């Protein structure tokens, strides 16, 4: 329970660190740590395959593309530090306003089965998977040109 | 009195904070395009996590499917957007200084 | 008539009346009745209560206008250059003054409307015209010469438009149906419906 | 439905041919083959549009009769 | 409660799309195969298939010749349109066998 | 030239057109979700 | 020569007034981003607004129109000063 | 200078007029597919680089 | 399995055409007319109703004026996405279809830009991308909250209503169209300002996505008219006209007048075809007259449908605003006529590729009298 709470609470700090830092490379590192913490949150809800998917697709592949771009477009963004006290508390107040008093539901634990998930992906929800494949094909054809 | 109720409230707070940090973070703290897309990815991950949470809550498979759909669509969008960013930076004229930081 | 000898149009007997006949056998309504909140806000009995219920609209509009202008200023200020002055000290007066002056104008409008209706005792066009005239007069206190005339006229004209097209227009054309037989003319042989058409359900957004 | 649809279609095929010649800078009599083709296809298309309109008119009549609109035999004659 | 046991090899599965309708007409075949549906395609439908094949051959040749590949475009277009229309006819015949669509000729022809 | 017959035929044509239009204006919702309003319509859903 | 309209003001003074529009131009995405976000949240909140009288709605629209400042007006008059 | 300039002009005009029909029609097609190949996002441009004077595939891209 | 075959045939068709084009790629046929005809034939297998037949008609008329196999393939992808937007039954279908369409828009915008046009076209594509990410993220977050609260995914909700407001391009969600379509190819702007709307209109009508609020359509009408009157550039005029008209059509569609909006979208496609694919002044003049709603052409019928639906619902403010904003927009259209014939000598490119432009002008002139029954 303490471990679950620590992860749920750490997600917000790892999200704040991304926007606050002025270096695009450092924000990517913070985002990778955020993605791992999201894997860890999904473990508490009972998902292993889905939490694996988040790490494989995002940490494994997407971050590599982001960092490839970041080195290619390398720019001097160490111009100045504008992180005055007045700005940071304003950001925190905005965040508190948005994330307060929303409807909360008891924390669930749900065991998943990739047998059932596979059967549904390829029998009943087969319309979904083929359209996702079409979207991937669109992205491939568009990005390569 | 109930740990699950407390954990549910903490999760709601955390996930909402992650979403709002993703959507408004890079624009509030004026950043380059590359950070904007990374924060958009953060927000999409927040929404997909909420759907997985709902699936665990209701013992239903709809959110699992919608989450894999989010992962695919977000990755495709990010790939195309990074293509556009690289092409945009390669066409920059010498006088242009912070081409990527339109939010300046 | 389409002739040059007798007057065009026609006349209906005032003595003779036609019994109302239902447009359809069974009536199903997809138009919801006014809510209790709408009747509460529309109530002008207590002028203070009427004013305080309807000002949040004016304050909201003033806040959006001030936020628009303040963001136009903020967008321009350079992040790369450190600024000696404090930006919020510059920007807060904009939003606060816009919101305050908008709220004051809306307060005059609503208060004068309710006070005139109470004193007159009747719901009329004149209450809106007088409240608008007062609001436009407050708008043009120290303004140059055309504006003392034009703003009372515009602010008075606005409630006339609201009354004419928000209240009179709907009530004038309630009876007209468009299906079955024309509202005036039921003697004519047109297909008669068992039920009225429902083109949409009652809305819930 | 319309009893003048085919004549209209033939005239409108003439409209197509002559307008296409005028826009391109040619005289109205140029490219004679376009005139015959435009007239014939436009006549056939105008006819076909008329039957499509009639068919959906009749479908609407059937639907409203099912729903409860008490259409008479003469009203049923209005929809061919 | 207790987890229900699952048999891994026999897990209930179903096709993605379903036609929500009870058969109005008699059911010659509850689950027709592809060849059963093709064998029940009417002669007029086959003539329509042949007409589409010929028309698409002519059109494919006309369009491909503008790109200096007339023969290949003609054959590809013919195959494409013929396959599509044949599947449409087979779907109609399968619906007729299932009793969803009119089947008087089908029931007479194959008892 | 029977003007009376022409007048009455023209008026009959216009009156028939009006009746047809008012029948054509009797429209319920055709929404696929709306099974209540259209309960009697013969439909099949493939979904 | 033809009769022509008299142009008020001096040529160089008018040109100097017009040159005050030549200032660093921000890109419009920054305004659009905030408008999109707050507009989405605003549309969500509007469904919960109380029903207002048509007269009050029209007066609010009039006040908003009068209070609206064109983006060019701020452009010409903006000073990076206290 | 006028005499010499018109000598060069005559050489050019002689070069243009002296081409045979089959060559002229081929050159018309060269100009046409030059215009069609101006778009550099075409799929074929990814395949090959075309010779400028005669739009024939010269080397792969 | 037979019900699945109907959808599967469309896939197999598209895949084999794709691989045939990849194999038969040559300089001899850069304009692949044969694959265009094959794509048009393949899209006939997806027609099941009148709205789907309208989708097919517009898709084919669009694919005629795209050049190359690759752009035609992505137009076919847009057609598939639109066909599934019409058939979507819950949140997931809506999302999958519409962001697939957004991906197709990004690709089509990228591939129709020259090297000299990259600086502005790629900027507009990137700005469109970020705004679309905002819209989709808000949609899916609120969808997660709704799916948690109700236990079911129902496409009759405020969330999908606001998302479809973004897709339509009304009131506070029209800026992405202004930024993107100003910097992209004229055909890309034309096909993606008309074709996407039909699927959204069908989804709204069929899934009961209607709200009691009239503010957004009113704001769309007034803002579009006034900004059209104040806009110097011609592209902005045409772009703001669509905002005004789609706000008015949104007001009509909420009240259940599906037939009239389905006719309006087609008449608007035909009317906009000529002004966007400007090759002749006279064709553009007729197109601009049709967009204005002017009587001798089919555009009068389409606007008349919407206006006739307005008087039925009997909302006076909407009618008064409609009249005044229509006058204001008419001034901008008159500016467009003035620029062509009454300002200066005009010389345009001789782009003699009027595939369906002459047919569209003929249809605008002719079609008024056959369709007069509608109004
Ligand atoms: C109204 C209300 C609205 C409601 C709904 C409206 C409906 C909406 C939809 C309606 C749409 C209508 C509007 C669009 C109209 C369509 C556009 C259009 O007009 O055509 C565009 C298109 C544009 O042509 P273009 O401007 O030259 O540009 C194309 C380029 O050439 C490009 O070159 P290319 O490389 O692409 O070449 C391909 C093409 C393009 O090539 C050409 O077009 C060149 C010209 C073709 C050869 C000349 C045609 C010969 C016959 C013409 C008759 C003219 C008579 C006038 C003079 C009288 C002579 C005695 O070649 C073809 O013509 C293919 C067709 C094959 C037929 C060829 C002729 C066969 C021999 C004759 C058959 C029968 C003869 C009997 C009698 C003959 C003597 C009368 O026109 C054609 O392609 C013509 C195709 C057909 C040729 C005419 C054949 C008619 C048959 C003879 C008449 C017999 C009576 C007819 C009834 C019986 C039929 C058998
Ligand atoms: C079967 C046996 C055969 C027997 C025959 C039976 C056939 C039936 C009819 C067939 C006759 C052929 C039709 C003519 C086709 C070409 C017409 C044309 O190009 O116009 C100018 C053309 C002469 O212009 P042009 O010197 O040769 O140079 C034109 C250049 O291309 C460009 O020159 P620009 O760049 O210098 O432009 C300057 C422009 C100054 O700029 C402007 O003013 C533009 C203003 C926008 C349009 C005007 C808006 C107002 C128009 C009102 C309509 C007039 C009728 C009013 C009656 C009320 C109807 C409700 O000034 C003008 O162009 C002329 C001003 C007056 C003409 C406006 C009327 C044209 C309406 C649309 C024409 C149809 C095009 C169809 C396209 C076909 C496929 C491409 O024709 C004329 O001599 C006068 C116009 C004749 C009007 C008849 C067209 C019917 C339109 C009435 C609509 C009713 C529905 C249609 C039913 C038709 C009966 C089924
Ligand atoms: C931190 C972020 C910063 C933003 C903060 C807010 C964030 C948004 C939150 C929520 C947003 C949703 C709600 C906001 C309003 C929706 C507008 C919108 O979002 O479009 C995107 C818009 C940007 O779009 P854009 O395409 O880039 O800009 C187009 C323009 O060309 C822009 O170029 P321009 O600025 O250079 O040109 C402006 C042009 C643009 O034209 C307009 O502004 C059109 C506005 C007309 C009214 C709009 C429809 C009103 C219906 C309201 C419905 C609710 C009430 C229902 C009943 C009312 C019945 C009418 O108008 C003018 O030229 C200046 C005059 C302004 C009003 C003109 C009418 C004057 C009538 C008064 C007559 C008195 C004079 C008599 C004496 C005359 C002597 C001869 O973003 C905004 O502007 C939002 C700013 C929020 C400030 C609005 C303040 C009041 C809002 C409520 C009052 C409603 C009246 C509207 C006032 C003007 C609003 C534009
Ligand atoms: C020839 C006989 C045709 C007469 C009747 C047609 C029905 C039989 C179809 C036979 C095919 C003829 C096509 C004509 C219409 C197309 C409709 C259709 O096909 O499906 C409807 C039909 C049944 O649907 P439905 O009759 O509409 O009734 C269903 C409910 O009522 C729900 O549908 P609903 O929406 O109609 O509901 C009633 C509706 C009442 O709605 C109506 O009243 C309809 C009004 C007629 C509008 C007509 C214009 C539509 C434009 C589409 C053009 C057709 C393109 C053809 C595409 C298919 C080609 C085969 O009430 C409403 O309130 C809904 C609003 C409707 C929209 C508003 C109408 C405005 C339209 C836009 C007009 C704007 C003006 C534009 C310019 C016009 C100027 C003159 O489905 C079928 O029968 C099977 C479709 C199979 C198609 C292709 C499959 C065969 C080939 C497969 C293999 C393909 C690959 C191999 C290729 C082989 C060749 C190489
Ligand atoms: C634009 C739409 C996007 C999304 C599309 C979703 C809709 C498509 C979903 C289906 C995807 C393809 C799945 C196959 C479709 C047809 C089903 C089928 O052919 O398989 C048969 C399997 O049976 C067969 O018919 C075997 C012959 C199959 C021959 C091949 C037919 C299907 C080919 C699929 C195409 C893939 C080939 C590669 C793609 C180019 C059905 O299984 P059963 O009949 O229940 O099991 C058989 C047991 N018994 C017969 C006794 C009842
Ligand atoms: C009259 C009935 C019999 C017609 C004979 C044709 C039957 C042959 C089988 C069908 C083949 C396709 C039909 C031809 C239509 C279009 C073909 C075409 O495009 O014509 C020319 C060029 O395009 C045109 O000229 C336009 C012609 C348009 C159509 C004019 C003919 C109209 C009648 C033919 C189709 C009638 C129906 C066909 C049978 C149903 C093709 O150029 P090439 O690829 O170089 O081939 C020519 C071979 N060689 C040069 C080596 C000698
Ligand atoms: C009841 C009707 C009223 C309702 C209206 C809607 C219904 C429409 C019915 C009529 C539709 C007619 C559409 C006319 C389109 C015009 C034809 C066309 O565009 O041809 C192009 C085609 O261009 C191409 O790209 C060719 C590739 C495709 C070729 C056609 C493919 C055919 C596919 C088969 C379709 C059959 C239907 C399938 C079964 C229904 C040729 O023009 P270009 O060469 O590109 O430039 C012209 C230059 N200039 C005029 C200035 C000289
Ligand atoms: C588009 C209409 C807008 C009006 C344009 C007028 C010119 C604008 C100048 C601005 C002046 C403010 C607007 C005042 C117009 C109202 C007319 C005054 C008549 C009047 O005072 O009688 C009232 C009723 O008239 C009424 O208030 C309702 C009459 C409706 C106004 C006239 C409508 C047709 C005018 C169109 C002219 C041409 C259009 C071009 C603008 C009182 O009535 P009561 O019930 O209160 O009894 C009293 C019991 N206490």
PDB file of N, CA, C and O in Angstrom, chain A residues 7 32-61 110-114 117, chain B residues 45 48-49 51-53 63-64 67-68 71:
ATOM      1  N   UNK A   7       4.164   5.451  -5.743  1.00  0.00           N
ATOM      2  CA  UNK A   7       4.192   5.531  -7.200  1.00  0.00           C
ATOM      3  C   UNK A   7       3.139   6.507  -7.716  1.00  0.00           C
ATOM      4  O   UNK A   7       3.428   7.368  -8.566  1.00  0.00           O
ATOM      5  N   UNK A  32      11.057   9.297 -19.665  1.00  0.00           N
ATOM      6  CA  UNK A  32      11.332   7.863 -19.588  1.00  0.00           C
ATOM      7  C   UNK A  32      11.067   7.352 -18.178  1.00  0.00           C
ATOM      8  O   UNK A  32      10.438   6.299 -17.980  1.00  0.00           O
ATOM      9  N   UNK A  33      11.524   8.105 -17.172  1.00  0.00           N
ATOM     10  CA  UNK A  33      11.253   7.702 -15.794  1.00  0.00           C
ATOM     11  C   UNK A  33       9.756   7.725 -15.496  1.00  0.00           C
ATOM     12  O   UNK A  33       9.245   6.848 -14.783  1.00  0.00           O
ATOM     13  N   UNK A  34       9.036   8.695 -16.062  1.00  0.00           N
ATOM     14  CA  UNK A  34       7.586   8.732 -15.917  1.00  0.00           C
ATOM     15  C   UNK A  34       6.941   7.493 -16.521  1.00  0.00           C
ATOM     16  O   UNK A  34       6.012   6.926 -15.940  1.00  0.00           O
ATOM     17  N   UNK A  35       7.414   7.067 -17.692  1.00  0.00           N
ATOM     18  CA  UNK A  35       6.819   5.908 -18.349  1.00  0.00           C
ATOM     19  C   UNK A  35       7.041   4.650 -17.521  1.00  0.00           C
ATOM     20  O   UNK A  35       6.155   3.792 -17.419  1.00  0.00           O
ATOM     21  N   UNK A  36       8.234   4.516 -16.936  1.00  0.00           N
ATOM     22  CA  UNK A  36       8.482   3.383 -16.048  1.00  0.00           C
ATOM     23  C   UNK A  36       7.566   3.426 -14.827  1.00  0.00           C
ATOM     24  O   UNK A  36       7.038   2.390 -14.396  1.00  0.00           O
ATOM     25  N   UNK A  37       7.347   4.617 -14.262  1.00  0.00           N
ATOM     26  CA  UNK A  37       6.425   4.720 -13.133  1.00  0.00           C
ATOM     27  C   UNK A  37       4.994   4.382 -13.557  1.00  0.00           C
ATOM     28  O   UNK A  37       4.219   3.844 -12.759  1.00  0.00           O
ATOM     29  N   UNK A  38       4.635   4.661 -14.812  1.00  0.00           N
ATOM     30  CA  UNK A  38       3.317   4.277 -15.318  1.00  0.00           C
ATOM     31  C   UNK A  38       3.204   2.761 -15.470  1.00  0.00           C
ATOM     32  O   UNK A  38       2.156   2.172 -15.158  1.00  0.00           O
ATOM     33  N   UNK A  39       4.276   2.108 -15.928  1.00  0.00           N
ATOM     34  CA  UNK A  39       4.327   0.648 -15.882  1.00  0.00           C
ATOM     35  C   UNK A  39       4.059   0.144 -14.477  1.00  0.00           C
ATOM     36  O   UNK A  39       3.267  -0.790 -14.274  1.00  0.00           O
ATOM     37  N   UNK A  40       4.700   0.776 -13.495  1.00  0.00           N
ATOM     38  CA  UNK A  40       4.608   0.313 -12.120  1.00  0.00           C
ATOM     39  C   UNK A  40       3.205   0.526 -11.564  1.00  0.00           C
ATOM     40  O   UNK A  40       2.698  -0.320 -10.823  1.00  0.00           O
ATOM     41  N   UNK A  41       2.549   1.618 -11.956  1.00  0.00           N
ATOM     42  CA  UNK A  41       1.156   1.823 -11.565  1.00  0.00           C
ATOM     43  C   UNK A  41       0.276   0.733 -12.156  1.00  0.00           C
ATOM     44  O   UNK A  41      -0.576   0.161 -11.465  1.00  0.00           O
ATOM     45  N   UNK A  42       0.468   0.425 -13.442  1.00  0.00           N
ATOM     46  CA  UNK A  42      -0.341  -0.613 -14.076  1.00  0.00           C
ATOM     47  C   UNK A  42      -0.150  -1.966 -13.402  1.00  0.00           C
ATOM     48  O   UNK A  42      -1.076  -2.785 -13.373  1.00  0.00           O
ATOM     49  N   UNK A  43       1.046  -2.231 -12.864  1.00  0.00           N
ATOM     50  CA  UNK A  43       1.236  -3.479 -12.124  1.00  0.00           C
ATOM     51  C   UNK A  43       0.325  -3.574 -10.907  1.00  0.00           C
ATOM     52  O   UNK A  43      -0.136  -4.669 -10.566  1.00  0.00           O
ATOM     53  N   UNK A  44       0.049  -2.454 -10.240  1.00  0.00           N
ATOM     54  CA  UNK A  44      -0.812  -2.501  -9.062  1.00  0.00           C
ATOM     55  C   UNK A  44      -2.267  -2.758  -9.430  1.00  0.00           C
ATOM     56  O   UNK A  44      -3.033  -3.252  -8.596  1.00  0.00           O
ATOM     57  N   UNK A  45      -2.668  -2.428 -10.659  1.00  0.00           N
ATOM     58  CA  UNK A  45      -4.023  -2.698 -11.122  1.00  0.00           C
ATOM     59  C   UNK A  45      -4.197  -4.114 -11.659  1.00  0.00           C
ATOM     60  O   UNK A  45      -5.326  -4.500 -11.976  1.00  0.00           O
ATOM     61  N   UNK A  46      -3.122  -4.890 -11.763  1.00  0.00           N
ATOM     62  CA  UNK A  46      -3.213  -6.271 -12.182  1.00  0.00           C
ATOM     63  C   UNK A  46      -2.847  -6.558 -13.620  1.00  0.00           C
ATOM     64  O   UNK A  46      -3.044  -7.692 -14.072  1.00  0.00           O
ATOM     65  N   UNK A  47      -2.326  -5.578 -14.352  1.00  0.00           N
ATOM     66  CA  UNK A  47      -1.935  -5.759 -15.743  1.00  0.00           C
ATOM     67  C   UNK A  47      -0.435  -6.005 -15.811  1.00  0.00           C
ATOM     68  O   UNK A  47       0.345  -5.241 -15.233  1.00  0.00           O
ATOM     69  N   UNK A  48      -0.026  -7.061 -16.512  1.00  0.00           N
ATOM     70  CA  UNK A  48       1.388  -7.242 -16.814  1.00  0.00           C
ATOM     71  C   UNK A  48       1.674  -7.018 -18.290  1.00  0.00           C
ATOM     72  O   UNK A  48       2.635  -6.328 -18.644  1.00  0.00           O
ATOM     73  N   UNK A  49       0.840  -7.585 -19.162  1.00  0.00           N
ATOM     74  CA  UNK A  49       1.050  -7.441 -20.596  1.00  0.00           C
ATOM     75  C   UNK A  49       0.883  -5.990 -21.022  1.00  0.00           C
ATOM     76  O   UNK A  49       1.702  -5.471 -21.783  1.00  0.00           O
ATOM     77  N   UNK A  50      -0.148  -5.306 -20.515  1.00  0.00           N
ATOM     78  CA  UNK A  50      -0.373  -3.912 -20.890  1.00  0.00           C
ATOM     79  C   UNK A  50       0.760  -3.012 -20.407  1.00  0.00           C
ATOM     80  O   UNK A  50       1.236  -2.137 -21.145  1.00  0.00           O
ATOM     81  N   UNK A  51       1.208  -3.214 -19.166  1.00  0.00           N
ATOM     82  CA  UNK A  51       2.325  -2.432 -18.652  1.00  0.00           C
ATOM     83  C   UNK A  51       3.599  -2.725 -19.425  1.00  0.00           C
ATOM     84  O   UNK A  51       4.420  -1.826 -19.636  1.00  0.00           O
ATOM     85  N   UNK A  52       3.771  -3.969 -19.868  1.00  0.00           N
ATOM     86  CA  UNK A  52       4.854  -4.290 -20.787  1.00  0.00           C
ATOM     87  C   UNK A  52       4.722  -3.508 -22.086  1.00  0.00           C
ATOM     88  O   UNK A  52       5.722  -3.051 -22.648  1.00  0.00           O
ATOM     89  N   UNK A  53       3.493  -3.376 -22.590  1.00  0.00           N
ATOM     90  CA  UNK A  53       3.270  -2.699 -23.865  1.00  0.00           C
ATOM     91  C   UNK A  53       3.674  -1.237 -23.761  1.00  0.00           C
ATOM     92  O   UNK A  53       4.287  -0.674 -24.677  1.00  0.00           O
ATOM     93  N   UNK A  54       3.322  -0.597 -22.645  1.00  0.00           N
ATOM     94  CA  UNK A  54       3.685   0.806 -22.452  1.00  0.00           C
ATOM     95  C   UNK A  54       5.197   0.993 -22.492  1.00  0.00           C
ATOM     96  O   UNK A  54       5.702   1.943 -23.100  1.00  0.00           O
ATOM     97  N   UNK A  55       5.938   0.094 -21.844  1.00  0.00           N
ATOM     98  CA  UNK A  55       7.392   0.204 -21.847  1.00  0.00           C
ATOM     99  C   UNK A  55       7.975  -0.076 -23.226  1.00  0.00           C
ATOM    100  O   UNK A  55       8.847   0.662 -23.697  1.00  0.00           O
ATOM    101  N   UNK A  56       7.511  -1.140 -23.884  1.00  0.00           N
ATOM    102  CA  UNK A  56       8.053  -1.511 -25.188  1.00  0.00           C
ATOM    103  C   UNK A  56       7.823  -0.410 -26.217  1.00  0.00           C
ATOM    104  O   UNK A  56       8.755   0.018 -26.906  1.00  0.00           O
ATOM    105  N   UNK A  57       6.578   0.054 -26.343  1.00  0.00           N
ATOM    106  CA  UNK A  57       6.256   1.016 -27.394  1.00  0.00           C
ATOM    107  C   UNK A  57       6.861   2.383 -27.094  1.00  0.00           C
ATOM    108  O   UNK A  57       7.467   3.011 -27.971  1.00  0.00           O
ATOM    109  N   UNK A  58       6.726   2.861 -25.858  1.00  0.00           N
ATOM    110  CA  UNK A  58       7.120   4.231 -25.532  1.00  0.00           C
ATOM    111  C   UNK A  58       8.599   4.328 -25.164  1.00  0.00           C
ATOM    112  O   UNK A  58       9.360   5.051 -25.815  1.00  0.00           O
ATOM    113  N   UNK A  59       9.013   3.611 -24.119  1.00  0.00           N
ATOM    114  CA  UNK A  59      10.401   3.685 -23.671  1.00  0.00           C
ATOM    115  C   UNK A  59      11.326   3.076 -24.717  1.00  0.00           C
ATOM    116  O   UNK A  59      12.368   3.646 -25.062  1.00  0.00           O
ATOM    117  N   UNK A  60      10.960   1.901 -25.232  1.00  0.00           N
ATOM    118  CA  UNK A  60      11.826   1.213 -26.176  1.00  0.00           C
ATOM    119  C   UNK A  60      11.973   1.929 -27.504  1.00  0.00           C
ATOM    120  O   UNK A  60      13.084   2.053 -28.030  1.00  0.00           O
ATOM    121  N   UNK A  61      10.867   2.411 -28.068  1.00  0.00           N
ATOM    122  CA  UNK A  61      10.853   2.881 -29.449  1.00  0.00           C
ATOM    123  C   UNK A  61      10.632   4.380 -29.585  1.00  0.00           C
ATOM    124  O   UNK A  61      11.405   5.055 -30.274  1.00  0.00           O
ATOM    125  N   UNK A 110      -7.784  -5.777 -10.831  1.00  0.00           N
ATOM    126  CA  UNK A 110      -8.390  -6.644 -11.819  1.00  0.00           C
ATOM    127  C   UNK A 110      -7.376  -7.487 -12.558  1.00  0.00           C
ATOM    128  O   UNK A 110      -6.527  -6.960 -13.282  1.00  0.00           O
ATOM    129  N   UNK A 111      -7.455  -8.802 -12.377  1.00  0.00           N
ATOM    130  CA  UNK A 111      -6.558  -9.702 -13.085  1.00  0.00           C
ATOM    131  C   UNK A 111      -6.975  -9.826 -14.541  1.00  0.00           C
ATOM    132  O   UNK A 111      -8.149 -10.054 -14.851  1.00  0.00           O
ATOM    133  N   UNK A 112      -6.004  -9.682 -15.432  1.00  0.00           N
ATOM    134  CA  UNK A 112      -6.215  -9.755 -16.866  1.00  0.00           C
ATOM    135  C   UNK A 112      -5.677 -11.072 -17.402  1.00  0.00           C
ATOM    136  O   UNK A 112      -4.775 -11.680 -16.817  1.00  0.00           O
ATOM    137  N   UNK A 113      -6.243 -11.510 -18.523  1.00  0.00           N
ATOM    138  CA  UNK A 113      -5.764 -12.702 -19.203  1.00  0.00           C
ATOM    139  C   UNK A 113      -5.516 -12.366 -20.661  1.00  0.00           C
ATOM    140  O   UNK A 113      -6.402 -11.842 -21.342  1.00  0.00           O
ATOM    141  N   UNK A 114      -4.310 -12.669 -21.133  1.00  0.00           N
ATOM    142  CA  UNK A 114      -3.970 -12.383 -22.520  1.00  0.00           C
ATOM    143  C   UNK A 114      -4.563 -13.433 -23.458  1.00  0.00           C
ATOM    144  O   UNK A 114      -4.638 -13.221 -24.673  1.00  0.00           O
ATOM    145  N   UNK A 117      -7.829 -11.687 -23.992  1.00  0.00           N
ATOM    146  CA  UNK A 117      -7.535 -10.496 -24.776  1.00  0.00           C
ATOM    147  C   UNK A 117      -7.204 -10.854 -26.217  1.00  0.00           C
ATOM    148  O   UNK A 117      -7.684 -10.201 -27.147  1.00  0.00           O
TER     149      UNK A 117
ATOM    150  N   UNK B  45      -0.929   9.237 -22.525  1.00  0.00           N
ATOM    151  CA  UNK B  45      -0.663   8.136 -21.600  1.00  0.00           C
ATOM    152  C   UNK B  45      -1.533   8.259 -20.356  1.00  0.00           C
ATOM    153  O   UNK B  45      -2.025   7.256 -19.825  1.00  0.00           O
ATOM    154  N   UNK B  48      -4.960   6.978 -21.368  1.00  0.00           N
ATOM    155  CA  UNK B  48      -4.954   5.527 -21.539  1.00  0.00           C
ATOM    156  C   UNK B  48      -4.886   4.812 -20.193  1.00  0.00           C
ATOM    157  O   UNK B  48      -5.506   3.756 -20.007  1.00  0.00           O
ATOM    158  N   UNK B  49      -4.139   5.372 -19.242  1.00  0.00           N
ATOM    159  CA  UNK B  49      -4.077   4.791 -17.905  1.00  0.00           C
ATOM    160  C   UNK B  49      -5.431   4.890 -17.218  1.00  0.00           C
ATOM    161  O   UNK B  49      -5.846   3.970 -16.502  1.00  0.00           O
ATOM    162  N   UNK B  51      -8.313   4.786 -18.716  1.00  0.00           N
ATOM    163  CA  UNK B  51      -9.121   3.727 -19.322  1.00  0.00           C
ATOM    164  C   UNK B  51      -8.772   2.345 -18.780  1.00  0.00           C
ATOM    165  O   UNK B  51      -9.671   1.538 -18.512  1.00  0.00           O
ATOM    166  N   UNK B  52      -7.484   2.051 -18.599  1.00  0.00           N
ATOM    167  CA  UNK B  52      -7.124   0.767 -17.993  1.00  0.00           C
ATOM    168  C   UNK B  52      -7.652   0.667 -16.564  1.00  0.00           C
ATOM    169  O   UNK B  52      -8.114  -0.399 -16.131  1.00  0.00           O
ATOM    170  N   UNK B  53      -7.596   1.774 -15.824  1.00  0.00           N
ATOM    171  CA  UNK B  53      -8.132   1.819 -14.470  1.00  0.00           C
ATOM    172  C   UNK B  53      -9.627   1.530 -14.462  1.00  0.00           C
ATOM    173  O   UNK B  53     -10.127   0.791 -13.606  1.00  0.00           O
ATOM    174  N   UNK B  63     -11.917  -0.712 -22.171  1.00  0.00           N
ATOM    175  CA  UNK B  63     -10.833   0.226 -21.927  1.00  0.00           C
ATOM    176  C   UNK B  63      -9.481  -0.311 -22.352  1.00  0.00           C
ATOM    177  O   UNK B  63      -8.621   0.444 -22.803  1.00  0.00           O
ATOM    178  N   UNK B  64      -9.273  -1.624 -22.212  1.00  0.00           N
ATOM    179  CA  UNK B  64      -8.041  -2.242 -22.697  1.00  0.00           C
ATOM    180  C   UNK B  64      -7.864  -2.026 -24.195  1.00  0.00           C
ATOM    181  O   UNK B  64      -6.777  -1.642 -24.661  1.00  0.00           O
ATOM    182  N   UNK B  67      -7.185   1.615 -24.979  1.00  0.00           N
ATOM    183  CA  UNK B  67      -5.827   1.967 -24.586  1.00  0.00           C
ATOM    184  C   UNK B  67      -4.804   1.513 -25.618  1.00  0.00           C
ATOM    185  O   UNK B  67      -3.865   2.256 -25.934  1.00  0.00           O
ATOM    186  N   UNK B  68      -4.954   0.296 -26.150  1.00  0.00           N
ATOM    187  CA  UNK B  68      -4.034  -0.104 -27.215  1.00  0.00           C
ATOM    188  C   UNK B  68      -4.243   0.782 -28.443  1.00  0.00           C
ATOM    189  O   UNK B  68      -3.282   1.148 -29.141  1.00  0.00           O
ATOM    190  N   UNK B  71      -2.333   3.965 -27.780  1.00  0.00           N
ATOM    191  CA  UNK B  71      -0.902   3.765 -27.971  1.00  0.00           C
ATOM    192  C   UNK B  71      -0.541   3.823 -29.451  1.00  0.00           C
ATOM    193  O   UNK B  71       0.367   4.567 -29.851  1.00  0.00           O
TER     194      UNK B  71
END
